[PDB]
Amino acid sequence: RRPWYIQGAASPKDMLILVDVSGSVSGLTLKLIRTSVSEMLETLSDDDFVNVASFNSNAQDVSCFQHLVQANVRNKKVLKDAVNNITAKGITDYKK
Amino acid sequence: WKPFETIILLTIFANCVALAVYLPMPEDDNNSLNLGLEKLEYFFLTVF
Numbered sequence: 001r002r003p004w005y006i007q008g009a010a011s012p013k014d015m016l017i018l019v020d021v022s023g024s025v026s027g028l029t030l031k032l033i034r035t036s037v038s039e040m041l042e043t044l045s046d047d048d049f050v051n052v053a054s055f056n057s058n059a060q061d062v063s064c065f066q067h068l069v070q071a072n073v074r075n076k077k078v079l080k081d082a083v084n085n086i087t088a089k090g091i092t093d094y095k096k
Numbered sequence: 097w098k099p100f101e102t103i104i105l106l107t108i109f110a111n112c113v114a115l116a117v118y119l120p121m122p123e124d125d126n127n128s129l130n131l132g133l134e135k136l137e138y139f140f141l142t143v144f
Binding site for chain 2: 022027089
């Protein structure tokens with residue numbers, strides 16, 4: 001996870017995290033999902049672009065961003081603070 | 097007074113089995129099967 005390693009081990013990315021916040025994930029798996037998305041954002045650099053979306057019978061952005069943003073320390077702070085505010089309710093729909 | 101014993105006993109038995117295969121999901125999720133066993137409740141609430 002050291003950035004020199006992640007830097008020399010693959011090319012840049014255009015990652016889009018897609019959290020599932022349907023009702024059935026509530027409980028344990030939801031908090032594991034929050035911690036996991038944070039620990040995944042921590043494997044990105046300033047060369048990569050990211051955004052966290054979220055779907056439960058309707059897909060929307062987890063935050064204020066609405067497209068791919070540059071994954072620097074400020075943007076990743078925004079996306080972590082937005083992922084921590086996540087709640088689970090609804091029916092699942094993977095197509096949307 | 098026909099053999100309606102069996103026709104209502106088996107209907108209640110199938111109602112029980114359809115009650116037991118239902119799977120309760122949290123926070124108001126659902127799956128395809130549960131949405132079918134409700135389209136089967138108007139068939140068990142008509143016969144009865």
